[PDB]
Short mmCIF file of C-alpha atoms in Angstrom, two decimals:
data_model
loop_
_atom_site.label_atom_id
_atom_site.label_comp_id
_atom_site.label_asym_id
_atom_site.label_seq_id
_atom_site.Cartn_x
_atom_site.Cartn_y
_atom_site.Cartn_z
CA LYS A 1 -20.10 39.96 76.10
CA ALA A 2 -17.38 42.40 74.98
CA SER A 3 -14.41 40.64 76.55
CA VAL A 4 -14.45 37.32 74.74
CA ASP A 5 -11.18 35.48 74.14
CA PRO A 6 -11.71 33.34 71.01
CA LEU A 7 -9.05 30.83 72.05
CA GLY A 8 -10.83 30.34 75.41
CA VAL A 9 -13.97 29.43 73.46
CA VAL A 10 -12.50 26.80 71.06
CA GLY A 11 -11.06 25.19 74.21
CA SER A 12 -7.89 23.76 75.73
CA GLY A 13 -6.33 20.34 75.14
CA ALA A 14 -6.35 20.50 71.34
CA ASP A 15 -3.77 18.79 69.11
CA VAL A 16 -3.67 21.69 66.58
CA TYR A 17 -4.52 25.39 67.04
CA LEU A 18 -5.25 27.52 64.03
CA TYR A 19 -5.48 31.23 63.35
CA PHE A 20 -6.68 32.31 59.96
CA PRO A 21 -7.31 35.94 58.99
CA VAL A 22 -9.61 36.14 55.94
CA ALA A 23 -8.28 39.38 54.38
CA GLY A 24 -5.38 38.42 52.10
CA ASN A 25 -6.19 34.71 52.24
CA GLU A 26 -9.50 34.73 50.32
CA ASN A 27 -8.00 32.66 47.53
CA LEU A 28 -6.63 30.00 49.89
CA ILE A 29 -10.05 29.84 51.56
CA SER A 30 -11.94 29.43 48.25
CA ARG A 31 -9.51 26.65 47.22
CA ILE A 32 -10.25 24.71 50.41
CA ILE A 33 -14.05 24.89 50.22
CA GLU A 34 -14.12 23.76 46.56
CA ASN A 35 -14.54 20.14 47.74
CA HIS A 36 -17.72 20.56 49.84
CA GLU A 37 -21.39 20.57 48.80
CA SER A 38 -22.19 23.61 51.00
CA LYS A 39 -19.58 25.64 49.06
CA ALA A 40 -22.13 28.26 47.96
CA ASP A 41 -23.47 28.64 51.55
CA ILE A 42 -20.02 28.63 53.22
CA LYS A 43 -18.52 31.29 50.89
CA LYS A 44 -21.40 33.46 52.13
CA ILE A 45 -20.64 33.07 55.87
CA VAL A 46 -16.97 33.47 54.98
CA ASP A 47 -17.63 36.73 53.11
CA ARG A 48 -18.98 38.00 56.44
CA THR A 49 -16.06 36.70 58.54
CA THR A 50 -12.94 38.68 59.49
CA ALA A 51 -10.94 36.01 61.33
CA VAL A 52 -11.24 32.31 62.07
CA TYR A 53 -9.85 30.66 65.25
CA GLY A 54 -9.78 26.85 65.24
CA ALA A 55 -8.79 23.88 67.38
CA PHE A 56 -8.57 20.26 66.28
CA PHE A 57 -8.97 17.34 68.73
CA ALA A 58 -7.84 13.94 67.46
CA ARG A 59 -9.40 11.78 70.21
CA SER A 60 -12.97 12.96 69.58
CA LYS A 61 -12.25 13.57 65.84
CA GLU A 62 -13.60 17.13 65.75
CA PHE A 63 -12.79 20.72 64.74
CA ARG A 64 -14.12 23.68 66.64
CA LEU A 65 -14.17 27.08 64.93
CA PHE A 66 -14.84 30.52 66.27
CA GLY A 67 -15.34 33.35 63.76
CA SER A 68 -15.29 37.11 64.30
CA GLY A 69 -17.45 38.89 61.75
CA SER A 70 -20.88 40.35 61.18
CA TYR A 71 -23.82 37.97 61.27
CA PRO A 72 -27.30 39.60 61.47
CA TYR A 73 -30.40 37.41 61.70
CA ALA A 74 -31.45 38.59 58.22
CA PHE A 75 -28.20 37.14 56.80
CA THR A 76 -28.24 33.84 58.72
CA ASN A 77 -31.95 33.35 57.90
CA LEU A 78 -31.23 33.00 54.15
CA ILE A 79 -28.41 30.40 54.36
CA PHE A 80 -30.17 28.02 56.79
CA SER A 81 -32.65 25.40 55.45
CA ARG A 82 -33.87 21.77 55.86
CA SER A 83 -33.17 21.16 52.14
CA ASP A 84 -29.46 21.33 53.06
CA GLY A 85 -29.86 18.66 55.79
CA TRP A 86 -30.22 21.00 58.77
CA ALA A 87 -32.62 21.23 61.72
CA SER A 88 -33.27 24.01 64.26
CA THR A 89 -33.81 30.80 66.45
CA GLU A 90 -34.26 31.35 70.25
CA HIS A 91 -33.39 34.10 72.84
CA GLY A 92 -31.16 35.92 70.31
CA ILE A 93 -29.23 32.78 69.45
CA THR A 94 -29.43 31.12 66.04
CA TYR A 95 -28.74 27.38 66.51
CA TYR A 96 -28.27 24.89 63.62
CA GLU A 97 -27.62 21.16 63.42
CA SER A 98 -26.85 18.55 60.79
CA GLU A 99 -25.32 15.05 60.72
CA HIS A 100 -21.70 16.17 61.13
CA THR A 101 -21.89 19.94 61.62
CA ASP A 102 -23.20 22.26 64.35
CA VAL A 103 -23.46 26.03 63.89
CA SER A 104 -24.63 28.85 66.12
CA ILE A 105 -24.58 32.66 66.09
CA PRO A 106 -24.55 33.58 69.79
CA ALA A 107 -24.14 37.28 68.95
CA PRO A 108 -24.05 39.71 65.97
CA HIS A 109 -20.23 39.58 65.84
CA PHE A 110 -19.47 35.87 66.69
CA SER A 111 -20.08 32.50 65.01
CA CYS A 112 -19.26 29.04 66.43
CA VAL A 113 -18.81 25.83 64.45
CA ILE A 114 -18.26 22.25 65.60
CA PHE A 115 -17.63 19.60 62.95
CA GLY A 116 -16.62 15.91 63.16
CA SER A 117 -17.68 12.52 64.54
CA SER A 118 -20.63 11.82 66.82
CA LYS A 119 -18.36 12.39 69.84
CA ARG A 120 -17.75 16.06 68.99
CA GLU A 121 -18.49 18.56 71.78
CA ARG A 122 -22.06 19.71 72.41
CA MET A 123 -22.65 23.26 71.20
CA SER A 124 -24.07 24.42 74.54
CA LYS A 125 -20.81 23.28 76.15
CA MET A 126 -18.72 25.36 73.69
CA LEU A 127 -21.08 28.33 74.25
CA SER A 128 -20.63 28.14 78.05
CA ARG A 129 -16.99 29.08 77.45
CA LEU A 130 -18.22 32.52 76.41
CA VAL A 131 -18.93 33.00 80.19
CA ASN A 132 -16.16 30.75 81.54
CA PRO A 133 -13.34 30.50 78.95
CA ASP A 134 -10.67 27.79 78.92
CA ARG A 135 -7.02 28.82 79.28
CA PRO A 136 -4.94 27.13 76.59
CA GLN A 137 -1.22 27.91 76.33
CA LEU A 138 0.03 29.19 73.03
CA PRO A 139 3.40 30.34 71.67
CA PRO A 140 4.21 34.07 71.79
CA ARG A 141 4.04 34.73 68.03
CA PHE A 142 0.80 32.77 67.71
CA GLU A 143 -0.69 34.97 70.47
CA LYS A 144 0.55 38.13 68.73
CA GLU A 145 -1.03 37.11 65.39
CA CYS A 146 -4.35 36.43 67.22
CA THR A 147 -4.53 39.97 68.68
CA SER A 148 -3.10 41.61 65.58
CA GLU A 149 -6.12 42.25 63.38
CA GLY A 150 -5.54 43.86 59.96
CA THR A 151 -1.90 44.83 60.60
CA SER A 152 -1.05 41.22 59.65
CA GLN A 153 -2.48 38.51 57.39
CA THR A 154 -0.29 35.68 58.64
CA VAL A 155 -1.90 32.26 59.03
CA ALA A 156 -0.68 30.74 62.29
CA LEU A 157 -0.59 27.08 63.33
CA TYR A 158 0.40 25.45 66.57
CA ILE A 159 0.81 21.71 66.27
CA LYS A 160 1.64 19.72 69.44
CA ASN A 161 2.96 16.63 67.64
CA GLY A 162 5.29 18.10 65.00
CA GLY A 163 6.96 14.76 64.20
CA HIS A 164 3.62 13.22 63.15
CA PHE A 165 2.75 16.39 61.15
CA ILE A 166 6.03 17.44 59.43
CA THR A 167 5.79 14.39 57.12
CA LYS A 168 2.77 15.96 55.32
CA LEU A 169 4.64 19.23 54.65
CA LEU A 170 7.84 17.51 53.43
CA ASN A 171 6.25 15.10 50.86
CA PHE A 172 6.99 12.17 53.23
CA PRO A 173 5.20 8.92 53.95
CA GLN A 174 4.31 8.98 57.68
CA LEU A 175 7.46 7.88 59.58
CA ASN A 176 6.73 8.79 63.26
CA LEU A 177 9.60 11.19 64.09
CA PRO A 178 10.77 11.76 67.73
CA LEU A 179 10.20 15.55 67.55
CA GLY A 180 7.89 17.87 69.53
CA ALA A 181 5.71 20.92 68.87
CA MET A 182 5.84 23.00 65.70
CA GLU A 183 4.85 26.58 65.14
CA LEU A 184 4.17 27.47 61.51
CA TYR A 185 3.54 30.96 60.14
CA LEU A 186 2.47 31.48 56.53
CA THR A 187 1.87 34.56 54.46
CA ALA A 188 0.49 34.94 50.93
CA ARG A 189 2.86 36.01 48.20
CA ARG A 190 0.84 36.06 44.95
CA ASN A 191 -0.20 32.46 44.13
CA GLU A 192 2.20 31.15 46.75
CA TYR A 193 2.80 31.19 50.51
CA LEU A 194 6.00 32.04 52.26
CA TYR A 195 6.41 30.24 55.58
CA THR A 196 8.62 30.08 58.64
CA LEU A 197 8.56 27.28 61.18
CA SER A 198 10.08 26.28 64.44
CA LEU A 199 10.43 22.69 65.59
CA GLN A 200 11.20 21.37 69.10
CA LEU A 201 14.06 18.88 68.89
CA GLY A 202 14.37 17.74 72.52
CA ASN A 203 17.82 16.38 73.42
CA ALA A 204 18.73 14.73 70.09
CA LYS A 205 21.16 16.83 68.07
CA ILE A 206 20.76 17.59 64.39
CA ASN A 207 24.17 17.66 62.63
CA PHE A 208 25.04 19.71 59.53
CA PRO A 209 24.57 16.89 56.95
CA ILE A 210 20.88 16.42 57.87
CA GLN A 211 20.55 20.24 58.22
CA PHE A 212 21.97 20.51 54.67
CA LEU A 213 19.74 17.88 53.04
CA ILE A 214 16.43 19.06 54.57
CA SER A 215 17.44 22.51 53.32
CA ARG A 216 17.71 21.15 49.79
CA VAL A 217 14.43 19.18 49.80
CA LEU A 218 12.69 22.34 51.06
CA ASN A 219 14.76 24.97 49.23
CA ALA A 220 15.04 27.18 52.32
CA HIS A 221 17.41 28.45 55.02
CA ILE A 222 17.86 26.31 58.13
CA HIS A 223 19.47 26.66 61.56
CA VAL A 224 19.42 25.32 65.11
CA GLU A 225 18.75 27.64 68.06
CA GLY A 226 19.08 25.83 71.38
CA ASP A 227 16.72 22.86 71.11
CA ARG A 228 14.76 24.29 68.16
CA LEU A 229 15.05 23.73 64.42
CA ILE A 230 14.22 26.88 62.53
CA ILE A 231 13.15 26.89 58.89
CA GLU A 232 12.77 30.18 57.02
CA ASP A 233 12.24 31.59 53.50
CA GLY A 234 10.39 28.40 52.60
CA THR A 235 7.69 28.52 49.95
CA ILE A 236 4.64 26.43 49.09
CA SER A 237 1.96 27.06 46.46
CA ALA A 238 -1.58 28.02 47.48
CA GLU A 239 -2.85 24.76 45.98
CA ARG A 240 -0.70 22.33 48.03
CA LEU A 241 -1.24 24.31 51.22
CA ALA A 242 -5.00 23.75 50.75
CA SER A 243 -4.84 19.92 50.84
CA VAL A 244 -2.40 19.98 53.79
CA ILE A 245 -4.90 22.04 55.85
CA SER A 246 -7.63 19.51 54.88
CA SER A 247 -5.48 16.50 55.89
CA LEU A 248 -5.79 17.43 59.61
CA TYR A 249 -9.26 15.84 59.53
CA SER A 250 -9.21 13.92 56.18
CA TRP B 1 49.80 -0.55 12.91
CA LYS B 2 46.55 0.26 11.06
CA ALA B 3 45.21 -3.35 11.33
CA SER B 4 43.47 -2.55 14.66
CA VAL B 5 44.03 -0.32 17.70
CA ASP B 6 42.49 -0.04 21.18
CA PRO B 7 41.69 3.68 21.69
CA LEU B 8 42.04 3.32 25.49
CA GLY B 9 45.57 1.96 25.09
CA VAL B 10 46.34 5.08 23.00
CA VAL B 11 45.07 7.69 25.50
CA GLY B 12 47.22 5.92 28.17
CA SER B 13 47.15 4.20 31.55
CA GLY B 14 47.30 5.90 34.98
CA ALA B 15 44.67 8.60 34.31
CA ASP B 16 42.47 10.11 37.02
CA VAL B 17 39.36 10.07 34.80
CA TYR B 18 38.45 7.92 31.74
CA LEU B 19 35.66 9.15 29.47
CA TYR B 20 33.73 7.74 26.54
CA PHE B 21 31.29 9.84 24.41
CA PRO B 22 29.48 8.53 21.41
CA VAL B 23 28.85 11.73 19.36
CA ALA B 24 25.31 10.91 18.10
CA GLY B 25 22.79 12.09 20.68
CA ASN B 26 25.46 13.97 22.64
CA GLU B 27 26.38 16.79 20.23
CA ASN B 28 25.12 19.56 22.50
CA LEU B 29 27.06 18.39 25.59
CA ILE B 30 30.25 17.93 23.62
CA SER B 31 29.87 21.45 22.15
CA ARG B 32 29.36 22.94 25.61
CA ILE B 33 32.49 21.25 26.95
CA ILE B 34 34.56 22.37 23.98
CA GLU B 35 33.22 25.94 24.35
CA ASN B 36 34.19 26.01 28.05
CA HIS B 37 37.86 25.70 26.94
CA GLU B 38 38.52 26.32 23.22
CA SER B 39 36.81 28.70 20.80
CA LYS B 40 38.52 27.51 17.58
CA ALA B 41 36.21 25.89 15.02
CA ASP B 42 38.70 23.22 13.93
CA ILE B 43 37.87 21.01 16.91
CA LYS B 44 34.10 21.52 16.46
CA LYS B 45 34.67 20.57 12.80
CA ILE B 46 36.54 17.44 13.85
CA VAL B 47 33.69 16.52 16.22
CA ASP B 48 31.13 16.74 13.41
CA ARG B 49 32.99 13.98 11.51
CA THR B 50 33.52 11.79 14.58
CA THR B 51 31.43 8.81 15.71
CA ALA B 52 33.09 8.22 19.12
CA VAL B 53 35.43 9.99 21.51
CA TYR B 54 37.70 8.27 24.06
CA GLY B 55 39.26 10.48 26.73
CA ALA B 56 41.60 10.40 29.69
CA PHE B 57 42.27 13.24 32.09
CA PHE B 58 45.56 13.36 34.04
CA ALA B 59 45.55 15.61 37.11
CA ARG B 60 49.33 15.79 37.75
CA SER B 61 50.29 17.03 34.28
CA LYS B 62 46.91 18.82 33.93
CA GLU B 63 45.85 17.43 30.54
CA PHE B 64 43.20 15.70 28.45
CA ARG B 65 44.23 13.12 25.88
CA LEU B 66 41.48 12.26 23.40
CA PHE B 67 41.16 9.73 20.67
CA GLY B 68 38.44 10.10 18.02
CA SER B 69 37.30 7.55 15.47
CA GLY B 70 35.59 8.97 12.39
CA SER B 71 36.18 10.12 8.83
CA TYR B 72 38.81 12.70 8.15
CA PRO B 73 39.57 12.95 4.40
CA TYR B 74 42.50 15.02 3.13
CA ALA B 75 39.94 17.40 1.59
CA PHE B 76 38.62 18.12 5.10
CA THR B 77 41.95 18.27 6.97
CA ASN B 78 43.58 20.52 4.37
CA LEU B 79 40.92 23.18 5.03
CA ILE B 80 41.40 23.37 8.81
CA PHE B 81 44.43 24.17 10.99
CA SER B 82 45.08 27.45 9.22
CA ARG B 83 48.04 29.54 10.40
CA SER B 84 45.78 32.59 10.89
CA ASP B 85 44.11 30.65 13.70
CA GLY B 86 47.50 30.09 15.40
CA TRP B 87 48.33 26.56 14.24
CA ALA B 88 51.85 25.52 13.34
CA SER B 89 52.36 22.24 11.52
CA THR B 90 55.31 19.88 10.96
CA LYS B 91 55.75 16.90 8.59
CA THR B 92 57.51 13.81 10.08
CA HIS B 93 57.18 9.61 8.88
CA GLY B 94 54.37 11.14 6.77
CA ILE B 95 52.34 12.12 9.85
CA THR B 96 51.70 15.83 10.35
CA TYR B 97 51.39 17.51 13.77
CA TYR B 98 49.34 20.58 14.51
CA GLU B 99 50.31 22.64 17.54
CA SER B 100 48.81 25.66 19.22
CA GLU B 101 49.10 27.34 22.65
CA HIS B 102 47.16 24.68 24.62
CA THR B 103 46.04 22.16 21.97
CA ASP B 104 47.92 19.61 19.88
CA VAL B 105 46.20 17.64 17.17
CA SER B 106 47.12 14.83 14.82
CA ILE B 107 45.21 12.79 12.18
CA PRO B 108 47.48 9.72 11.75
CA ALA B 109 45.01 7.84 9.54
CA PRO B 110 41.84 8.92 7.69
CA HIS B 111 39.67 7.25 10.35
CA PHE B 112 41.55 8.30 13.55
CA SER B 113 42.18 11.63 15.27
CA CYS B 114 44.34 12.39 18.37
CA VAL B 115 44.05 15.51 20.54
CA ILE B 116 46.11 16.58 23.54
CA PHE B 117 44.90 19.58 25.50
CA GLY B 118 46.11 21.33 28.64
CA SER B 119 49.10 22.86 30.36
CA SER B 120 52.70 23.07 29.21
CA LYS B 121 53.32 19.67 30.97
CA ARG B 122 50.92 17.86 28.56
CA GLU B 123 52.22 14.73 26.78
CA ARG B 124 54.19 15.02 23.56
CA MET B 125 52.14 14.03 20.48
CA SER B 126 54.76 11.59 19.17
CA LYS B 127 54.72 9.88 22.55
CA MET B 128 50.98 9.41 22.30
CA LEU B 129 51.30 8.24 18.65
CA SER B 130 53.86 5.62 19.66
CA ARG B 131 50.99 3.95 21.51
CA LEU B 132 49.36 3.11 18.15
CA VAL B 133 52.20 0.53 17.93
CA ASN B 134 52.70 -0.26 21.64
CA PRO B 135 49.42 0.48 23.53
CA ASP B 136 49.09 0.93 27.29
CA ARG B 137 46.74 -1.37 29.25
CA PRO B 138 44.46 0.61 31.57
CA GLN B 139 41.89 -1.29 33.62
CA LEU B 140 38.24 -0.40 33.29
CA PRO B 141 35.01 -1.78 34.83
CA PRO B 142 32.78 -4.05 32.66
CA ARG B 143 30.05 -1.60 31.73
CA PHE B 144 32.57 1.06 30.72
CA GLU B 145 34.15 -1.54 28.38
CA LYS B 146 30.73 -2.55 27.07
CA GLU B 147 29.90 1.08 26.20
CA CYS B 148 33.25 1.56 24.34
CA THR B 149 32.50 -1.37 22.00
CA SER B 150 28.86 -0.52 21.40
CA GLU B 151 28.71 2.60 19.21
CA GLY B 152 25.69 2.57 16.90
CA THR B 153 23.60 0.65 19.44
CA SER B 154 24.07 2.82 22.57
CA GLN B 155 24.34 6.58 23.11
CA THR B 156 25.29 6.29 26.77
CA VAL B 157 28.14 8.51 28.03
CA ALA B 158 30.59 6.73 30.35
CA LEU B 159 33.01 8.02 32.98
CA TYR B 160 35.32 6.18 35.32
CA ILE B 161 36.67 8.36 38.11
CA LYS B 162 39.47 7.21 40.47
CA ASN B 163 38.73 9.82 43.19
CA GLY B 164 34.95 9.62 43.27
CA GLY B 165 34.73 11.72 46.45
CA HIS B 166 35.71 15.02 44.81
CA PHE B 167 33.65 14.42 41.67
CA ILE B 168 30.42 13.28 43.27
CA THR B 169 30.16 16.50 45.33
CA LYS B 170 30.56 18.63 42.16
CA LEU B 171 28.02 16.44 40.40
CA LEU B 172 25.39 16.56 43.17
CA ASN B 173 26.29 20.16 44.08
CA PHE B 174 26.92 19.25 47.72
CA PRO B 175 29.72 20.61 49.90
CA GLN B 176 32.99 18.69 49.62
CA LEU B 177 32.87 16.72 52.90
CA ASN B 178 36.20 15.25 51.75
CA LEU B 179 36.61 12.00 53.71
CA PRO B 180 37.97 10.54 50.41
CA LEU B 181 36.13 7.53 49.03
CA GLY B 182 37.01 5.00 46.32
CA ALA B 183 36.29 4.78 42.60
CA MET B 184 33.11 5.97 40.92
CA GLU B 185 31.46 4.62 37.75
CA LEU B 186 28.97 6.97 36.06
CA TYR B 187 26.71 6.32 33.05
CA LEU B 188 24.59 9.04 31.47
CA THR B 189 21.99 9.25 28.73
CA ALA B 190 20.46 12.36 27.11
CA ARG B 191 16.79 13.28 27.80
CA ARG B 192 16.01 16.63 26.13
CA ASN B 193 18.35 19.24 27.67
CA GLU B 194 19.29 17.12 30.68
CA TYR B 195 20.99 13.82 31.44
CA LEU B 196 19.70 10.72 33.21
CA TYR B 197 22.44 8.85 35.07
CA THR B 198 23.24 5.87 37.23
CA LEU B 199 26.40 5.60 39.30
CA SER B 200 28.12 3.45 41.87
CA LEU B 201 30.66 4.80 44.31
CA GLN B 202 33.03 2.70 46.42
CA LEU B 203 32.64 3.76 50.06
CA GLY B 204 35.36 1.90 52.00
CA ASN B 205 35.06 1.80 55.81
CA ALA B 206 32.91 4.95 55.44
CA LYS B 207 29.27 4.57 56.53
CA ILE B 208 25.92 5.88 55.31
CA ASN B 209 22.96 5.45 57.67
CA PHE B 210 19.37 4.97 56.45
CA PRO B 211 18.16 8.53 57.32
CA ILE B 212 20.76 10.15 54.99
CA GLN B 213 19.99 7.52 52.33
CA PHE B 214 16.27 8.42 52.24
CA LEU B 215 16.99 12.16 52.29
CA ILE B 216 19.47 11.99 49.40
CA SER B 217 16.97 9.97 47.34
CA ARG B 218 14.44 12.80 47.83
CA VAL B 219 16.99 15.54 47.15
CA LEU B 220 18.05 13.86 43.88
CA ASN B 221 14.61 12.38 43.11
CA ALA B 222 16.21 9.02 42.39
CA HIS B 223 16.32 5.42 43.57
CA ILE B 224 19.30 4.71 45.80
CA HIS B 225 20.74 1.79 47.80
CA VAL B 226 23.94 0.26 49.19
CA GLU B 227 25.10 -3.00 47.57
CA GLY B 228 27.94 -3.98 49.93
CA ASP B 229 30.36 -1.04 50.18
CA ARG B 230 29.05 0.45 46.92
CA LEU B 231 26.53 3.31 46.96
CA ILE B 232 24.16 3.14 43.98
CA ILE B 233 22.05 5.95 42.56
CA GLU B 234 19.68 5.28 39.65
CA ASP B 235 17.62 7.77 37.65
CA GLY B 236 19.33 10.88 38.99
CA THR B 237 19.24 13.88 36.69
CA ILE B 238 21.52 16.78 35.89
CA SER B 239 21.31 19.55 33.25
CA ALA B 240 23.63 19.26 30.25
CA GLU B 241 24.90 22.75 31.13
CA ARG B 242 25.92 21.57 34.60
CA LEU B 243 27.36 18.25 33.44
CA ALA B 244 29.47 20.14 30.86
CA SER B 245 30.69 22.49 33.58
CA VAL B 246 31.52 19.61 36.00
CA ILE B 247 33.54 17.78 33.30
CA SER B 248 35.37 20.80 31.95
CA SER B 249 36.25 22.00 35.46
CA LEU B 250 38.67 19.05 35.84
CA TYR B 251 41.12 21.39 34.07
CA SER B 252 42.21 24.75 35.61
#
C-alpha cells in the first residue's frame, strides 16, 4: 500500500541490482532507448517516472524493473495497443503482455516490468511481493541512494560477480578474474559521468605495479582498503556508459 | 683524411647514449631539443644545412658530441659565429674553432660539422678532430648501423642506450622502479606532431609476468612481447614535445 520497498519487489537472488534516478540522467536514458522500436512509447512512461529500481537474473535471463512515478489510467490507456504486439484493465490493475515484455500498473504511483526469456518470472508472482516483499542484502551506499530521492542523482549498481563484469568497463576481452562483488556509483557531469567503485579482492594482494597500471588505463586515483580495491575520480562518456548498461542482457 | 670518415668513430667510443637523426622529416624535434638548451641561431642555421646528425652523450663528463654531414660554404660560415653572440674563434692547421660558454663548434671541411656541448669537463675540440684521422670503434646493434647508412631512404630516428632502465621510465612516464636492466634500442618515426616507435630492452634475470605485459600494452596502446630476455614494444607513441624533453634531459 504505502509501505512498499521497491527492492523487496524486484526480488532477492539477483546477479546485478540497479538504482537509476531519472532527474539528471534523462540524456543517458534517451541514449539507451534509441535502439528499441518502442522508443516513442517508452520515453512516455519514462517521462512519468521518478526512479527506476532493477534486478538482473542471469539463470532465467530476465530483468525486473520497479518504477516510482505517476501513472493514471488515462495515461496508460494511450500507450497500450495490439498494433505494438501486446495483449491484455481489471480491479484497478492495468496488465500488459507481449512476447518478451510484461508490464503492469498495480497502483497510481508504481509500475512493474519484467523482460527477458520465456523463463522470466510471472507478473503475478512479482506483484505478490507488494504484500510479502523479499529481503535482498545491499551495500550501505546503495541503500542510501535508494532512499535518497532528489537530494542525489547518483546511478547505483551492485554487481555480485565483479571479475566477470569489470572487463566490460576496462575495454577488456572477457578474462574471468578471481574477484568478488563491485559497487559502482556514477554521476552526470555534462556529457560525461564521474564514477567511483569498490571491488572485493578476497585474499589475493594487489601490489603497486598493478595498482599503477590500472590507474593509467583508467586515468583515475586508486587505493587498497583492507580487502577492497577503490577506484575514484574516474570518468566515462554518456555514450559508452549506455552500451555497458545494455550489455548486462545483450 | 677527407677521403672518408665514420661519423660514429668521430663522436667517440664509451658513450652512454648514441643517437642518429636524419634532418628531413625531423626538423621540429631537432628544433625543440636545441631550444631546450641553446637559444643561439647559429646552431639552428647549421641544422638547416645538415642532412644527418650523429650524436653521443657521455654521462660522466656531462656532454654531447655531435657530428653533422651537410653543406657549409665559407659564405655561410663567415656570417655566423659573430662575437656579439659570445663566440671566440682561433685559427690553427687551417681549421678554425668557435668557442662559447657551453658550446664548441668546428667546420673542418665544407661537408662536415662538429659540435661539443655541455659542462666544463666536455672534450677538447682538437681531441675530437684528431678522430678524423684515428677514429674510435664503438659497437652498435645492426639496425642502428643500418639507419646511419641510409639517409635519403629512411627518416627513422635511432637511439642506443646502455642503461635502458633509467631511460625507459622517462620515456613511458612510469616511476623509476630502478632494478637496473640492460641495453635498450629505440627507433622512432614522425607521424604529425608525435612519434611512432619500436624498442627492445634487455631484461637480464629480471622477470615480467603475463598480467603486467597485457596491462602495459593497453597503457601504451601497442603490441608487446618477450623474445628471450628482450622486451619488445611495437607501435608505441609519444609526443614530439615529450620525446624532445626526454632526450634533452640527459644533460643537467
